[PDB]
Design an enzyme around this catalytic site. Structure first.
Site, PDB file in Angstrom:
ATOM      1  N   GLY B 150     -30.674  19.927  32.149  1.00 31.65           N
ATOM      2  CA  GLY B 150     -31.167  19.426  30.881  1.00 31.65           C
ATOM      3  C   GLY B 150     -32.351  20.244  30.404  1.00 31.65           C
ATOM      4  N   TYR B 156     -38.739  26.221  33.425  1.00 27.32           N
ATOM      5  CA  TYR B 156     -38.569  26.602  34.821  1.00 27.32           C
ATOM      6  C   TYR B 156     -39.085  28.005  35.117  1.00 27.32           C
ATOM      7  CZ  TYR B 156     -35.572  22.478  35.413  1.00 27.32           C
ATOM      8  OH  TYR B 156     -35.107  21.183  35.513  1.00 27.32           O
ATOM      9  N   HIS B 162     -42.212  22.553  34.754  1.00 30.87           N
ATOM     10  CA  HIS B 162     -41.589  22.167  36.022  1.00 30.87           C
ATOM     11  C   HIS B 162     -41.898  23.128  37.157  1.00 30.87           C
ATOM     12  CE1 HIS B 162     -39.554  18.993  34.056  1.00 30.87           C
ATOM     13  NE2 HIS B 162     -38.615  19.725  33.479  1.00 30.87           N
TER      14      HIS B 162
END
Ligand SMILES: Cc1cc2nc3c(=O)[nH]c(=O)nc-3n(C[C@H](O)[C@H](O)[C@H](O)COP(=O)(O)OP(=O)(O)OC[C@H]3O[C@@H](n4cnc5c(N)ncnc54)[C@H](O)[C@@H]3O)c2cc1C
Ligand SMILES: Cc1cc2nc3c(=O)[nH]c(=O)nc-3n(C[C@H](O)[C@H](O)[C@H](O)COP(=O)(O)OP(=O)(O)OC[C@H]3O[C@@H](n4cnc5c(N)ncnc54)[C@H](O)[C@@H]3O)c2cc1C
Ligand SMILES: O=C1Oc2ccccc2C(=O)[C@@H]1C[C@H]1C(=O)Oc2ccccc2C1=O
Ligand SMILES: O=C1Oc2ccccc2C(=O)[C@@H]1C[C@H]1C(=O)Oc2ccccc2C1=O
Ligand SMILES: O=C1Oc2ccccc2C(=O)[C@@H]1C[C@H]1C(=O)Oc2ccccc2C1=O
Lengths: 273, 273
Positions: B150, B156, B162
């Site tokens: 998602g 990332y 994250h």
């Protein structure tokens, strides 16, 4: 510590296991200090670990194109979640402290515990996109992993063949616990329990009870605060420019996941600052 | 490529999903190149993902104190594993290439796939203490993760909210796959698939099919070879002294998990060297 509530989630099939003894030691130590203790022994519960449309009662919004995140979030808001999920969510809402007791399996949590996260940590209840990580719904709670391994600690040291345990813990402690707002306490790591004799295992149990006497007052692990990031798609949810400029000449990155291409700060996921 | 065999393990409940489309695209592209293709569609199989003593038939060695490692290894050697486990192990034995197609869930594999590893990757069959990592039983095979997320790619990146996706991949690619001997190929990472328009999605499927036309000839990801470590329990499986001395004056560690407190080489878990 009267008035505080704890939840112990156990993921082991055997009542003869050391994991079960660690659960019993934790429950006994916390109750002795005045805690209320509630348990989720997933194996003893025959807990269903597979997300599916059977987690939702009543009408599905789009049954022809089933999207579990949207449908479960709508189910949560409308009170249409499966009763076994609602029961676990109530335990979480009540708990101040959540202990996860499990054997390390394939360098992570057992499947039955992974499925507990997937079915219970429903959107809006456990997390929101607009308030990820330190702003999450569980920011007033503390969570701790209590892990047993077959492999010795040296296998998970920086020079061990398995590699740094800090890297192994990151997706669980940052991605699952801290993503939802938990302050994450130092994990209780019990290495190579299969090579520990009986009297030493007793001292491991006693040490864990000892730590629990003051666990609420511990300093939690460090994760980079969300205030360091531009939380929008035009900036790409990246770290702020002025933060990057301030960090550019420090030798260590901020955490395991925010190593920034630099040295990971020692035991970021194992020891508090 | 006639003669070579692939196994596609899919962990998604919905035939209407992009994950299912990626499974179908993979099967068609490999078959067009002469591959034999077998599938483990874990949801359509109703695969049971929970390890327990019901994985083992016949006489247990010690039923009063059940220990899954010893009992399952003994059951594998004596042909007493449950038939559903045996069938998956036979699929693995036949396969040259194993594709794992799944949506990222709580920064890891879905529970149903985690339990597949737990029930199917039995000691002696999939790994041995005497031949860890690159000497493992699957060393003639290659594996690849095909993940949809998602979250967006920038989330990332090294500066994303994250954290580095290379850290998230490490426990799966090194710990689950490489520990058994697999050469691990570059993962197929499909970011923010719920915010990718239809035109782009179709091309993603075509690109995946294009990559699969020469997948077997790709260079795999880099893991530190086991020859760098002293491979016995007494020595703790620690990196050899001469190897530590030689790496001391190098600026980068060897991999994500063997970062050695130094900079992680860029995209160690995402790009071959
Ligand atoms: C699928 C699977 C995957 C695994 N993957 C990994 C991995 O990736 N990395 C790794 O390092 N390990 C791994 N392991 C090994 C696993 O982590 C260890 O087997 C596990 O931690 C052992 O903990 P246990 O509770 O089962 O101990 P047990 O084996 O059940 O017990 C250990 C000892 O403690 C004794 N004991 C029980 N109760 C008490 C009590 N009150 N007081 C004192 N002693 C007591 C027991 O009798 C026993 O002798 C894996 C195991 C499995 C089955
Ligand atoms: C418990 C849970 C935990 C999660 N944890 C994370 C996490 O930690 N990090 C993260 O980033 N995400 C996470 N997610 C999000 C998850 O990774 C995404 O929802 C998932 O990857 C979406 O993949 P899908 O196959 O379901 O896409 P779908 O929503 O099913 O499909 C996306 C689009 O592709 C379309 N499509 C289908 N077939 C085709 C076709 N042949 N051709 C062209 N288009 C097609 C579909 O119609 C749809 O419109 C989680 C989700 C759940 C349920
Ligand atoms: O290190 C490990 O990684 C695993 C990954 C997947 C599945 C199982 C395991 C293990 O059993 C453990 C511990 C394992 C153990 O319990 O005893 C030993 C005895 C001699 C040499 C080495 C060891 C181990 O590493
Ligand atoms: O594509 C985009 O680029 C932008 C550029 C400037 C300003 C706003 C936007 C957006 O809203 C997003 C849509 C955005 C996207 O594409 O990725 C996502 C991934 C996960 C969840 C939600 C989303 C989005 O809404
Ligand atoms: O779908 C999304 O909606 C958003 C809207 C606004 C801003 C960011 C996001 C996201 O991060 C993504 C993906 C989102 C993510 O990035 O990580 C997760 C971790 C656990 C469970 C679910 C997820 C997600 O779906």
């Amino acid at each position: 510590m009267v008035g505080r509530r704890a939840l112990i989630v156990l993921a082991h099939s055997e009542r003869t296991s050391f994991n079960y003894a660690m659960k019993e030691a934790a429950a006994a130590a916390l109750k002795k200090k005045g805690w209320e203790v509630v348990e989720s022994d997933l194996y003893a519960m025959n807990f269903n670990p597979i997300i599916s449309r059977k987690d939702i009662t009543g009408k599905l919004k789009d049954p022809a194109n089933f999207q579990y995140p949207a449908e479960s979030v709508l189910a949560y808001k409308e009170g249409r979640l499966s009763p076994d999920i609602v029961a676990e969510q109530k335990k979480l809402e009540a708990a101040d402290l959540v202990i996860f007791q499990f054997p390390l399996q394939w360098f992570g949590v057992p499947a039955i515990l992974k499925g507990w996260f997937e079915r219970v940590f429903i959107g809006e209840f456990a997390y929101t996109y607009a308030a990820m990580y330190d702003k999450g719904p569980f920011r007033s709670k503390k969570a701790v992993l209590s892990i047993t391994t077959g492999g010795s600690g040296s296998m998970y040291s920086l020079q061990g063949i398995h590699g740094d345990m800090n890297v192994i813990l990151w997706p669980i402690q940052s991605g699952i616990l801290h993503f939802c707002g938990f302050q994450v306490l130092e994990p209780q790591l019990t290495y190579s329990i299969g090579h520990t004799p009986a009297d030493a295992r007793i001292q491991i149990l006693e040490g864990w009870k000892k730590r629990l006497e003051n666990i609420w007052d511990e300093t939690p692990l460090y994760f980079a605060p969300s205030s360091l990031f531009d939380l929008n798609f035009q900036a790409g949810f990246l770290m702020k420019k002025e933060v990057q400029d301030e960090e550019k000449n420090k030798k260590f990155g901020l955490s395991v996941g925010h190593h920034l291409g630099k040295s990971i700060p020692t035991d970021n996921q194992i020891k508090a600052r």
